[PDB]
Short mmCIF file of all heavy atoms in Angstrom, two decimals:
data_model
loop_
_atom_site.label_atom_id
_atom_site.label_comp_id
_atom_site.label_asym_id
_atom_site.label_seq_id
_atom_site.Cartn_x
_atom_site.Cartn_y
_atom_site.Cartn_z
N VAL B 40 83.58 97.13 104.28
CA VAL B 40 84.36 95.89 104.49
C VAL B 40 85.69 96.29 105.13
O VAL B 40 86.35 97.19 104.57
CB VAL B 40 84.60 95.14 103.17
CG1 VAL B 40 85.26 93.80 103.41
CG2 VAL B 40 83.29 94.98 102.40
N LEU B 41 86.06 95.62 106.22
CA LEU B 41 87.35 95.82 106.92
C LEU B 41 88.08 94.49 106.89
O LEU B 41 87.43 93.42 107.01
CB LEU B 41 87.16 96.25 108.38
CG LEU B 41 86.46 97.58 108.62
CD1 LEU B 41 86.47 97.91 110.11
CD2 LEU B 41 87.07 98.71 107.82
N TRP B 42 89.39 94.55 106.79
CA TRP B 42 90.25 93.37 106.89
C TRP B 42 91.39 93.69 107.85
O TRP B 42 92.17 94.62 107.56
CB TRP B 42 90.77 92.91 105.53
CG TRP B 42 91.65 91.69 105.59
CD1 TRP B 42 93.01 91.69 105.70
CD2 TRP B 42 91.26 90.31 105.51
NE1 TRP B 42 93.48 90.41 105.68
CE2 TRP B 42 92.44 89.54 105.56
CE3 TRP B 42 90.04 89.64 105.40
CZ2 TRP B 42 92.45 88.15 105.53
CZ3 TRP B 42 90.05 88.26 105.35
CH2 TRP B 42 91.23 87.52 105.43
N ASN B 43 91.47 92.87 108.89
CA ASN B 43 92.53 92.89 109.93
C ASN B 43 93.70 92.06 109.43
O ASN B 43 93.62 90.80 109.48
CB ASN B 43 92.02 92.32 111.24
CG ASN B 43 93.00 92.41 112.39
OD1 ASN B 43 94.20 92.28 112.20
ND2 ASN B 43 92.48 92.55 113.60
N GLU B 44 94.79 92.71 109.02
CA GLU B 44 95.91 91.96 108.40
C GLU B 44 96.60 91.02 109.39
O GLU B 44 96.97 89.91 108.98
CB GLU B 44 96.94 92.92 107.80
CG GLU B 44 98.02 92.19 107.04
CD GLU B 44 97.55 91.52 105.76
OE1 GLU B 44 96.37 91.61 105.38
OE2 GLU B 44 98.38 90.90 105.12
N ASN B 45 96.82 91.42 110.64
CA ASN B 45 97.50 90.52 111.61
C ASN B 45 96.64 89.28 111.88
O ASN B 45 97.21 88.20 111.99
CB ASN B 45 97.74 91.18 112.96
CG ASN B 45 98.84 92.21 112.95
OD1 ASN B 45 99.70 92.22 112.06
ND2 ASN B 45 98.82 93.07 113.96
N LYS B 46 95.34 89.45 112.09
CA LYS B 46 94.43 88.33 112.48
C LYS B 46 93.98 87.55 111.24
O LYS B 46 93.46 86.45 111.41
CB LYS B 46 93.19 88.84 113.20
CG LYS B 46 93.47 89.64 114.46
CD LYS B 46 93.87 88.79 115.64
CE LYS B 46 93.43 89.42 116.94
NZ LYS B 46 94.05 88.76 118.10
N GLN B 47 94.12 88.13 110.04
CA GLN B 47 93.58 87.56 108.79
C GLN B 47 92.08 87.32 108.95
O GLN B 47 91.63 86.19 108.73
CB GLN B 47 94.34 86.28 108.45
CG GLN B 47 95.81 86.56 108.12
CD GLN B 47 95.98 87.24 106.78
OE1 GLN B 47 96.12 88.47 106.66
NE2 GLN B 47 95.98 86.44 105.72
N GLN B 48 91.33 88.35 109.30
CA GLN B 48 89.88 88.27 109.53
C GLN B 48 89.22 89.47 108.89
O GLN B 48 89.81 90.57 108.98
CB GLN B 48 89.54 88.28 111.03
CG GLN B 48 90.03 87.08 111.79
CD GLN B 48 89.42 87.08 113.18
OE1 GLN B 48 89.99 87.60 114.13
NE2 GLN B 48 88.20 86.57 113.28
N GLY B 49 88.07 89.25 108.28
CA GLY B 49 87.24 90.26 107.62
C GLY B 49 85.98 90.53 108.43
O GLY B 49 85.50 89.61 109.09
N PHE B 50 85.45 91.73 108.30
CA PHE B 50 84.21 92.19 108.95
C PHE B 50 83.47 93.08 107.97
O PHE B 50 84.12 93.86 107.24
CB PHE B 50 84.54 92.95 110.24
CG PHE B 50 85.45 92.20 111.18
CD1 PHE B 50 86.83 92.33 111.10
CD2 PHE B 50 84.93 91.35 112.15
CE1 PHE B 50 87.66 91.63 111.96
CE2 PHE B 50 85.76 90.65 113.00
CZ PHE B 50 87.13 90.80 112.92
N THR B 51 82.13 93.02 107.96
CA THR B 51 81.29 93.81 107.06
C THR B 51 79.90 93.97 107.68
O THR B 51 79.50 93.08 108.45
CB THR B 51 81.23 93.16 105.66
OG1 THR B 51 80.45 94.03 104.85
CG2 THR B 51 80.66 91.77 105.68
N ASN B 52 79.18 95.03 107.33
CA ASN B 52 77.77 95.18 107.77
C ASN B 52 76.84 94.33 106.88
O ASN B 52 75.66 94.17 107.26
CB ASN B 52 77.32 96.62 107.72
CG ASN B 52 77.42 97.16 106.32
OD1 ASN B 52 78.50 97.08 105.73
ND2 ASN B 52 76.33 97.72 105.81
N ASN B 53 77.32 93.84 105.72
CA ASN B 53 76.46 93.18 104.69
C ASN B 53 77.32 92.26 103.82
O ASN B 53 77.90 92.77 102.82
CB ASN B 53 75.76 94.22 103.83
CG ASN B 53 74.74 93.64 102.88
OD1 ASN B 53 74.82 92.48 102.52
ND2 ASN B 53 73.85 94.47 102.42
N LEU B 54 77.39 90.98 104.16
CA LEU B 54 78.21 89.98 103.43
C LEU B 54 77.79 89.92 101.95
O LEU B 54 78.68 89.78 101.09
CB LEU B 54 78.07 88.60 104.07
CG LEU B 54 78.91 88.34 105.31
CD1 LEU B 54 78.27 87.25 106.16
CD2 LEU B 54 80.35 87.97 104.94
N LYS B 55 76.50 90.00 101.63
CA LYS B 55 76.08 89.91 100.21
C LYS B 55 76.63 91.10 99.43
O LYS B 55 77.20 90.91 98.33
CB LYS B 55 74.56 89.89 100.04
CG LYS B 55 73.87 88.62 100.49
CD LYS B 55 72.41 88.63 100.09
CE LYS B 55 71.68 87.37 100.47
NZ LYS B 55 72.16 86.18 99.74
N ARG B 56 76.45 92.31 99.97
CA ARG B 56 76.86 93.53 99.26
C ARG B 56 78.39 93.57 99.21
O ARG B 56 78.89 94.14 98.22
CB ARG B 56 76.28 94.80 99.85
CG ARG B 56 76.62 96.01 99.02
CD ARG B 56 75.79 97.22 99.28
NE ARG B 56 76.20 98.31 98.44
CZ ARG B 56 75.42 99.27 98.02
NH1 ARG B 56 74.13 99.24 98.31
NH2 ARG B 56 75.91 100.25 97.28
N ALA B 57 79.07 92.94 100.17
CA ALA B 57 80.56 92.93 100.22
C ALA B 57 81.06 92.24 98.95
O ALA B 57 82.14 92.60 98.48
CB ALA B 57 81.08 92.25 101.44
N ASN B 58 80.27 91.30 98.42
CA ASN B 58 80.65 90.47 97.24
C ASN B 58 79.92 90.94 95.98
O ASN B 58 80.19 90.36 94.94
CB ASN B 58 80.41 88.98 97.50
CG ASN B 58 81.41 88.40 98.47
OD1 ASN B 58 82.61 88.46 98.24
ND2 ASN B 58 80.93 87.88 99.58
N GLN B 59 79.13 92.00 96.03
CA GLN B 59 78.48 92.59 94.84
C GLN B 59 79.53 93.36 94.03
O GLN B 59 80.21 94.26 94.57
CB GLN B 59 77.30 93.47 95.23
CG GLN B 59 76.56 94.02 94.01
CD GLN B 59 75.29 94.77 94.31
OE1 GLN B 59 74.84 94.84 95.45
NE2 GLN B 59 74.69 95.34 93.27
N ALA B 60 79.66 93.05 92.75
CA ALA B 60 80.66 93.70 91.88
C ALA B 60 80.03 94.88 91.15
O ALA B 60 78.97 94.72 90.51
CB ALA B 60 81.26 92.66 90.98
N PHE B 61 80.71 96.03 91.19
CA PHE B 61 80.32 97.29 90.54
C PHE B 61 81.46 97.81 89.65
O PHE B 61 82.58 97.35 89.80
CB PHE B 61 80.03 98.36 91.58
CG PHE B 61 79.00 98.02 92.62
CD1 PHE B 61 79.35 97.42 93.82
CD2 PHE B 61 77.65 98.27 92.36
CE1 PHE B 61 78.38 97.13 94.77
CE2 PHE B 61 76.69 97.99 93.31
CZ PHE B 61 77.05 97.43 94.52
N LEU B 62 81.16 98.81 88.82
CA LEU B 62 82.17 99.62 88.12
C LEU B 62 83.05 100.29 89.17
O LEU B 62 82.56 100.81 90.18
CB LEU B 62 81.48 100.68 87.27
CG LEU B 62 80.87 100.12 86.00
CD1 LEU B 62 79.73 101.01 85.53
CD2 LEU B 62 81.94 99.95 84.95
N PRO B 63 84.38 100.19 89.00
CA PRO B 63 85.30 100.76 89.99
C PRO B 63 85.40 102.28 89.92
O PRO B 63 85.81 102.88 90.94
CB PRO B 63 86.65 100.12 89.65
CG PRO B 63 86.53 99.74 88.17
CD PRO B 63 85.07 99.41 87.97
N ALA B 64 85.05 102.86 88.75
CA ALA B 64 85.17 104.30 88.45
C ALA B 64 86.55 104.77 88.94
O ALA B 64 87.58 104.08 88.58
CB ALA B 64 84.03 105.06 89.08
N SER B 65 86.59 105.85 89.71
CA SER B 65 87.91 106.50 89.97
C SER B 65 88.84 105.64 90.83
O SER B 65 90.04 105.97 90.87
CB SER B 65 87.75 107.83 90.60
OG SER B 65 87.31 108.76 89.62
N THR B 66 88.35 104.57 91.45
CA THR B 66 89.24 103.67 92.24
C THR B 66 90.15 102.95 91.26
O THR B 66 91.19 102.43 91.68
CB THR B 66 88.50 102.66 93.10
OG1 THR B 66 87.77 101.70 92.32
CG2 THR B 66 87.60 103.39 94.07
N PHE B 67 89.76 102.94 89.99
CA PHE B 67 90.58 102.29 88.94
C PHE B 67 91.90 103.05 88.74
O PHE B 67 92.81 102.52 88.11
CB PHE B 67 89.79 102.18 87.61
CG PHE B 67 90.50 101.30 86.61
CD1 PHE B 67 90.48 99.93 86.79
CD2 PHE B 67 91.18 101.84 85.55
CE1 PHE B 67 91.16 99.11 85.91
CE2 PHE B 67 91.87 101.01 84.68
CZ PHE B 67 91.86 99.65 84.87
N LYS B 68 92.01 104.29 89.19
CA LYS B 68 93.24 105.09 89.11
C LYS B 68 94.38 104.33 89.79
O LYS B 68 95.52 104.51 89.38
CB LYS B 68 92.98 106.50 89.67
CG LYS B 68 92.18 107.41 88.74
CD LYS B 68 92.23 108.87 89.15
CE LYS B 68 91.67 109.79 88.08
NZ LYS B 68 90.21 109.92 88.23
N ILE B 69 94.09 103.47 90.76
CA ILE B 69 95.16 102.70 91.44
C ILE B 69 95.77 101.76 90.41
O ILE B 69 96.96 101.88 90.16
CB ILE B 69 94.71 101.99 92.73
CG1 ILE B 69 94.24 102.99 93.78
CG2 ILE B 69 95.84 101.14 93.25
CD1 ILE B 69 93.61 102.35 94.97
N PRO B 70 95.06 100.78 89.81
CA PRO B 70 95.72 99.90 88.84
C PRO B 70 96.22 100.67 87.60
O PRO B 70 97.26 100.34 87.04
CB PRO B 70 94.68 98.83 88.50
CG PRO B 70 93.36 99.44 88.90
CD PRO B 70 93.70 100.31 90.10
N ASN B 71 95.46 101.66 87.17
CA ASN B 71 95.83 102.47 85.96
C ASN B 71 97.22 103.11 86.20
O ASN B 71 98.09 103.00 85.34
CB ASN B 71 94.71 103.45 85.63
CG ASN B 71 94.75 103.96 84.20
OD1 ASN B 71 95.63 103.60 83.41
ND2 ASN B 71 93.77 104.78 83.85
N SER B 72 97.49 103.71 87.36
CA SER B 72 98.79 104.32 87.72
C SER B 72 99.88 103.27 87.70
O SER B 72 100.98 103.56 87.17
CB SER B 72 98.75 104.93 89.08
OG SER B 72 97.74 105.90 89.13
N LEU B 73 99.61 102.10 88.31
CA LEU B 73 100.61 101.03 88.42
C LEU B 73 101.07 100.65 87.02
O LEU B 73 102.29 100.46 86.82
CB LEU B 73 100.02 99.82 89.11
CG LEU B 73 99.87 99.95 90.62
CD1 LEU B 73 98.99 98.81 91.16
CD2 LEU B 73 101.25 99.97 91.30
N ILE B 74 100.10 100.41 86.14
CA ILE B 74 100.40 99.94 84.76
C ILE B 74 101.18 101.04 84.02
O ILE B 74 102.24 100.74 83.37
CB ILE B 74 99.11 99.52 84.06
CG1 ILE B 74 98.50 98.28 84.72
CG2 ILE B 74 99.43 99.26 82.58
CD1 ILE B 74 97.04 98.08 84.40
N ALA B 75 100.73 102.29 84.13
CA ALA B 75 101.34 103.44 83.44
C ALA B 75 102.79 103.59 83.92
O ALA B 75 103.69 103.81 83.10
CB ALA B 75 100.50 104.68 83.64
N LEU B 76 103.04 103.42 85.22
CA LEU B 76 104.42 103.54 85.74
C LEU B 76 105.24 102.34 85.26
O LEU B 76 106.39 102.52 84.87
CB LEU B 76 104.40 103.58 87.26
CG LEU B 76 104.00 104.91 87.85
CD1 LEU B 76 103.45 104.69 89.27
CD2 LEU B 76 105.16 105.87 87.84
N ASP B 77 104.67 101.14 85.29
CA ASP B 77 105.50 99.95 85.00
C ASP B 77 105.88 99.96 83.53
O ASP B 77 106.98 99.50 83.23
CB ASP B 77 104.85 98.63 85.37
CG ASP B 77 105.90 97.56 85.67
OD1 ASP B 77 106.72 97.77 86.60
OD2 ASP B 77 105.88 96.54 84.98
#
Side-chain angles (χ1 to χ4, degrees):
Chain B
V40 186
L41 298 185
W42 180 268
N43 185 324
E44 185 69 2
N45 287 340
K46 301 284 210 192
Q47 294 288 97
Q48 294 191 268
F50 308 90
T51 183
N52 60 306
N53 188 336
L54 279 156
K55 289 189 178 294
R56 185 163 180 151
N58 288 302
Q59 183 173 355
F61 304 92
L62 285 155
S65 285
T66 66
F67 191 74
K68 285 194 169 86
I69 298 172
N71 200 0
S72 302
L73 284 168
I74 293 161
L76 282 156
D77 206 59

